């Protein structure tokens, strides 16, 4: 997260870290056994780490659970990043409580101008590389469709939206992929891609989760 602030421990209890001997993507706990992340984060041997704040120190509220299954959307396209969503089943259910909790799926898509919270352990520098220890948060508006398509001509599908600032200076960055964009207590987006991080007129692009609510429900129902 570039231009964000330290969230505070336990303040984003649905945020997970995907770990393979290092943090490589975030995700969101949507119920005690399932996490939503980005399809481009897929890899074998994922350990899901719940209740984290400092990802380098065991501080107390952590739960490390191996992924049992990673269901990448069958129409994910790695070139266009269309349908960039993956469900992860946990080997074992999480212990839900204060410090660890699920986030609700939306029943409706969000309007332009809605304020959202984006969080993650990604890079905090636009030109450089500085990875935080602790979770970083950032408030950002969903931008209009026309501004999103003007920023990325030919590249925005129905399953995407842009959020952030056209002035630059505040954005999600590498390491934040697969994490949550929460608006009004509902998961509306998944961190997916962009041209760099926090660049002028190149806002972050996000997977539009309201287009996937039936897919998520039916898949979870089947596995």
């Amino acid at each position: 997260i570039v231009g964000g602030y330290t969230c505070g421990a336990n303040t984003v209890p649905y945020q997970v870290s995907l770990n393979s001997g290092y943090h490589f993507c975030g995700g969101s706990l949507i119920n005690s056994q399932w996490v939503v992340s980005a399809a481009h984060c897929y890899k074998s041997g994922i350990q899901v780490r719940l209740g984290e704040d400092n990802i380098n120190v065991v501080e107390g509220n952590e739960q490390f659970i191996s992924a049992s299954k990673s269901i990448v959307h069958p129409s994910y396209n790695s070139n266009t990043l269309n349908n960039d969503i993956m469900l992860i089943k946990l080997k074992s259910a999480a212990s839900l409580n204060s410090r660890v909790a699920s986030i609700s799926l939306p029943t409706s898509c969000a309007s332009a101008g809605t304020q959202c919270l984006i969080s993650g352990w990604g890079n905090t520098k636009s030109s450089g590389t500085s990875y935080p220890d602790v979770l970083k948060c950032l408030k950002a508006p969903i931008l209009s469709d026309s501004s999103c398509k003007s920023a990325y001509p030919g590249q925005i599908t129905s399953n995407m939206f842009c959020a952030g600032y056209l002035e630059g200076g505040k954005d999600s960055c590498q390491g934040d992929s697969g994490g949550p964009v929460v608006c009004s207590g509902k998961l509306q987006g998944i961190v997916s891609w962009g041209s760099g991080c926090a660049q002028k007129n190149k806002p972050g692009v996000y997977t539009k989760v309201c287009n996937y609510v039936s897919w998520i429900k039916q898949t979870i129902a089947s596995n």
Binding site: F24, C25, H40, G122, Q174, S177, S192, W193, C197
Partner: peptide, 9 residues
């Protein structure tokens, strides 16, 4: 680029 570590550009 995707925002994964490492990025996929």
């Amino acid at each position: 680029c995707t925002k994964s570590i490492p990025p996929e550009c």
